[model samples]
Target: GSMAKAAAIGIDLGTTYSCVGVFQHGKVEIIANDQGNRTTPSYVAFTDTERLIGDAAKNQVALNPQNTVFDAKRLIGRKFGDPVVQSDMKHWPFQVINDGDKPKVQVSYKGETKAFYPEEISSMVLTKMKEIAEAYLGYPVTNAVITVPAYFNDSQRQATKDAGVIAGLNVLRIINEPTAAAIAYGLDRTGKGERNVLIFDLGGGTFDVSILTIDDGIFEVKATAGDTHLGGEDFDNRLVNHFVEEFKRKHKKDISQNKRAVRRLRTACERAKRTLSSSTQASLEIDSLFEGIDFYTSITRARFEELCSDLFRSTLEPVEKALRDAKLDKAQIHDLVLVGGSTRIPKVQKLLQDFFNGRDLNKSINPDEAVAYGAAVQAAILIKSTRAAA
Candidate 1:
């Protein structure tokens, strides 16, 4: 088929999840991997035969935290002495052991111990995304456009490219998440004119706000700001803290003593957070060896808002700062777009509404799929043998 010759693939090597997509038959299609899942968890697990990738590896972390790497994105291209790395090390559950001159995460699995650079861990995930593209196109993917955080520094950007290289991908270009979101949204518009747009991206591990001006077919990023520390992961931590305090308050016992119990509690918190987003209240239950019991707790929408107020407030600062960076006022923004799964929270929506003075926000696209879809569009452009004639 002539349409098959025009296919182009793209990958989003995200901090928490990776996705791959391809432009085929004049439409963008996301390619799911062997797990029947669109996202490959940004995780790696070691075993005797080889290694487990994606969701399988993420699921193994609770059973063997010492043998699984869950959030290597935090440590990538950072020194042990770097302030951010040092700060994150104190809070992260995984153990960081010194490996020669470099600090690395170490894990023991299948009767052997091994240490890996953050790039290596990320490469495993990229390789998985590439595998999906290969299967979908029935050909190897050598060129691809990958996305990164808008606020990622020089080293962080280079590290992402390096991961692609180690995974055998020719990194065409690394676009920012917000810029990619704008591309996907702009495509849906008919006959685009000059418009000021705001993109708020809150993902599993980072949050970013970007302002862009699209004129005709050209999309230019005017400004961007974000707190890499903020996102759904913070909500997860808050939930875990909530459970820890609730368990101690009710049973007069500290359940934090056991690592496995803590992992399970974290998982439970994640589930509760997702559920609370849709329902007025969410129920949480946990069981552990030290606290031999089943307990039920509920979190209402008001409570979720209250618990997450500070985090939401923190997000507003970036929105203001981005406006300043872009030299644009709230009145100038033609549209406000929310991207990422966490934005489904009502509080997040209300915060945006309040900040922009009730500007009608757009929620037509699937937040989780927008970034990957935009990446595929960019991949199509990059793979073209020649640029459009000016």
Candidate 2:
């Protein structure tokens, strides 16, 4: 009755990548896929022979985008006419159709065409997450708590639960992304007083900043603010556009209209962006990116920052708004907890540090797995409560 006897996992079902964690042997352990990555790319693909999800799907998306669905979270539970969804899908390589009431994703696989609700595609992703957990735990894992964005609406929230059910998971709860990260950050606290924490989450495509108060293992969200359109993906686009413009001026050929070439170029830009995070300069070489032209470009960290600094700075605006909405002063927040992959950027880290007057931001936990582990913690609690009720 004191602890969970059944296995339960915490899942962070995100737009770009997802992670799963389980409470095993007294601590939360993130389940690594067979590919040895802590998190899997949230992509689903179908072809003539077989269906692919996770890493395999992502690796082949640019080449086979017509049948590959990634970032369906952006389309889930929204009308096709919604301005946000309309603008979001404009850059997507796949197709979205207005199915009257809601949007549907269209894909052609095995010489057959079909349209699927956004939730169905997300279910495929959750299915992969469940399978990975099962493979790691050596048992069928069903009960889980999945985390989603704080800004999601009612329909969007239920769509995630529906997706979990479709994936054969008995969802224990739907936790807020930032609150779950706060729980993970609140771990190992021995203090007898409440702690104020600020969790700044910047994922591949969206950003969320939240103010939370924690006491005796309970977390309460004070205020949450976010820019649904800002993250690493935008930075990746900036680099890609710079190179595209560079190539256009040099050869007088604009490849921006070419989806195939732009997709390929984006892949290279994403790699260079990651490299610039740890190195002063990064080089990209794309073979035959244009009219028999080999594209080679190099960008220094400073130049890269110059390209994305405005976007990066805009993220902080929400931070100030969240703090203000919480009615808490900057100093009242005890911990500056950062979550998500984009936080690894040196410029992002430095800006946050100086904003807090050089206070050290917490970096003790893995950025990618925090929300998943936190969800797992909630799953464990739910399992315990169920047992207690019995």
Candidate 3:
């Protein structure tokens, strides 16, 4: 008997999370690490004793923001003068300093100081994904189908590949995020001949809309448009500032004045935001800010929508632009797919439905997991190599 082993891995290295998957025995499976979570936290922590990766490092961010790198996706392949860098600079806690010809984040841990580029920081996360795949398949992985934002430019795409190299993984191809989303949707699940689909991807740190045409086994991206700096992170910033104002009004002191207080507010606001997505109202409770009193603030879904409308509008512009770029009208989209955590917001869904003129929307899979599944499917196709063998 002859045996064939899968060699290709698919990686969805997102701003907030990184996932690796492979297709095996006609099943798409997300490779989980020892932590039992399918996706790895896209974070890295530098310490004098050792470097920490994934969820543990991400959890330490509130206490050691300086040493923990989160959301380095915004810095990848961006110059200091770029709009994304300039906008992110206003609120990002990590100090971004330009040293010589490179921009880097400075961190201090266990009496050691170090500066790291976004590529190097992201590599740590990618390496963790590779390790998981290796452990699962019992072999080292060299080739991968790495995904990037559809609108990623030359330098940004290059940086993603560079991170793969740093992680000791071979980037077989750099696929677009929306394309991977469609693959996971399985537009061909029923063996439909061909369909024109619209993919709205609003991830933690980026917003992208893509018009794709899927025919048989071929998927082509007709057009794509997005704002790299607009996403759930921006919505979080809105809530963060709202909390800052409320805290200052309640107690005549600025919450941002203390890093710990700022972190606490962010955590509370994020919790409230997630809760309000499913419920009509959500509340925030925090202590030590108002003379040993616990402060409470309530928010309704309506209020959340009101506060997030402008950001939601920012997402729609790209959708319209993508439609125009593809020379297709809203009526032409046969399937509408939502991808990302922000899509869970009722307002986002309603607005998209209205814009598409009541086209059926699909959310069959968890938005966070869709791309990872697609990556796995692609991995299967690559590793199986039916055409390569022929």
Q: How many residue pairs clash in each candidate?
A: 0, 1, 0
Q: For model 1, how does the per-residue alpha-carbon lDDT over 70-129 read when each residue is reduced to its tens digit?
A: 778777777777777777777665778766545688777567777788888888888888
Residue 256 accuracy (lDDT) in model 2: 88
Q: Give the C-alpha miss distance for residue 220 in model 3, angstroms.
A: 3.1
Better of 1 and 3 by TM-score: 1
Span of ten consecutive residues with least summed lDDT in model 1: 1-10
Ranking of predictions according to TM-score: 2, 1, 3
Q: Candidate 2 versus the native: TM-score?
A: 0.89
For model 2, how does the per-residue alpha-carbon lDDT over 277-298 read when each residue is reduced to its tens digit?
8899999998898788998778
Can you tell me which runs of candidate 3 are displaced by over 4 Å?
4-7, 32-36, 77-117, 134-142, 188-194, 243-256, 386-390
Candidate 3, residues 1-390, lDDT tens digits: the string is: 957664688889988898888877777778888989988889888776768999888877776776778888888988867766778777777788876645688888667777888999988899999999999999878888888887789999999999999999878788888888888877756475768888888888777788888887678889988887787877888888877887778777666777777778778888888998889999788877545657777878787788878888777899888988999888878899889878888888888998888766888777777787787787667655454553
Ranking by lDDT: 2, 3, 1
Selected candidate, larger TM-score, 2 vs 3: 2
Q: For model 1, how many clashes?
A: 0
Name the regions of candidate 1 deviating beyond 4 angstroms.
1-6, 93-115, 187-193, 248-253, 286-290, 385-390
Q: Roughly what TM-score does model 3 have, to 2 decimal places?
A: 0.85
Prediction 3 global C-alpha lDDT: 0.82
Assess the local accuracy of residue 298 in candidate 2 as a C-alpha lDDT between 0 and 100.
88
